Amino acid sequence: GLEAVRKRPGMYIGSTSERGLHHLVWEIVDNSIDEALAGYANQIEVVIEKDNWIKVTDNGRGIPVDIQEKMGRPAVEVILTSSVVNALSQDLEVYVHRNETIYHQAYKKGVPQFDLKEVGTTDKTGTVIRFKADGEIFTETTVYNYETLQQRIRELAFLNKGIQITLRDERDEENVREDSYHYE
């Protein structure tokens, strides 16, 4: 089912060009926005990291991790192994804060590298997604454009007043830029 994505990506994502690259960010973010619209998240952060990794953080409830009765996998693994973003990423990581626990899993091309495991304790809730778009699939470019992300971020915040959405470019550690939107 997921190899179907990696082989016919545009049928899911729409071209493998730059707009396709940026579509990835919006898929994860839209999801965080759902968490806000459901009334739990009020802080969303997007970071462009070295290597053009992308990180997205919200403080919603965190993707569920309970064993989803049917195959015996944590719901979050079940969900991530249906994520187009995961499928079109050469590496993807997730961290869930839930039940005062930090849960972690990593993937390659949508394939789980190991079982979901607890890697810490926390007094927060929420989800962290870090993914690195697949170079094999996004030829042409794998470099995110700041302006493009920023404009969409701004609309998204104005569309969802009361939700703080922060964008930050860390691809140059000596020169770090951030914009943060929070409309009353």
Ligand X SMILES: COC(=O)NCc1cc(-c2sc(-c3ccccc3)nc2N2CCC(O)CC2)[nH]n1
Identify the CA nearest to 33 among candidates 65, 58, 12, 64.
58
Tell me: does residue 44 bind ligand X (CB under 6 A). no
Written as one string, the DSSP assignment of 78-101 is HHHTT-HHHHTEEEEEEEEEETTE
Task: Give whichever of 16 and 127 is closer to ligand X, judged by the CB atom.
Answer: 127
Q: Could you say whether residue 105 binds ligand X (CB under 6 A)?
A: no
Answer yes or no whether residue 83 interacts with ligand X by CB under 6 A.
Answer: yes
Expressed in percent and rounded to 5, the helix, strand and coil fractions of the chain are: 30, 30, 40
**Spatial separation of the C-alpha atoms in residues 177 and 2, rounded to whole Å:** 35
Which residue is nearest to ligand X, using beta carbons?
31
Q: Which of 48, 88, 129, 133 binds ligand X (CB under 6 A)?
A: 129
Alpha carbon 43 to its chain centroid, in Å, reads 14
Does the footprint of ligand X cover residue 93 (CB under 6 A)?
Answer: no
| CA dihedral for 172, 155, 92, 74, sign (positive or negative) | positive
Query: Binding residue for ligand X (CB under 6 A) from 5, 21, 35, 157?
Result: 35
Give me 86's structure tokens: 């995961």
Is residue 45 close enough to count as binding ligand X by CB under 6 A?
Answer: no
64 is a site residue for ligand X (CB under 6 A): yes
| Per rule CB under 6 A, count of chain residues that contact ligand X | 14
Which residues here bind ligand X, judged by CB under 6 A?
28, 31-32, 35, 58, 60-61, 63-64, 79-80, 83, 127, 129
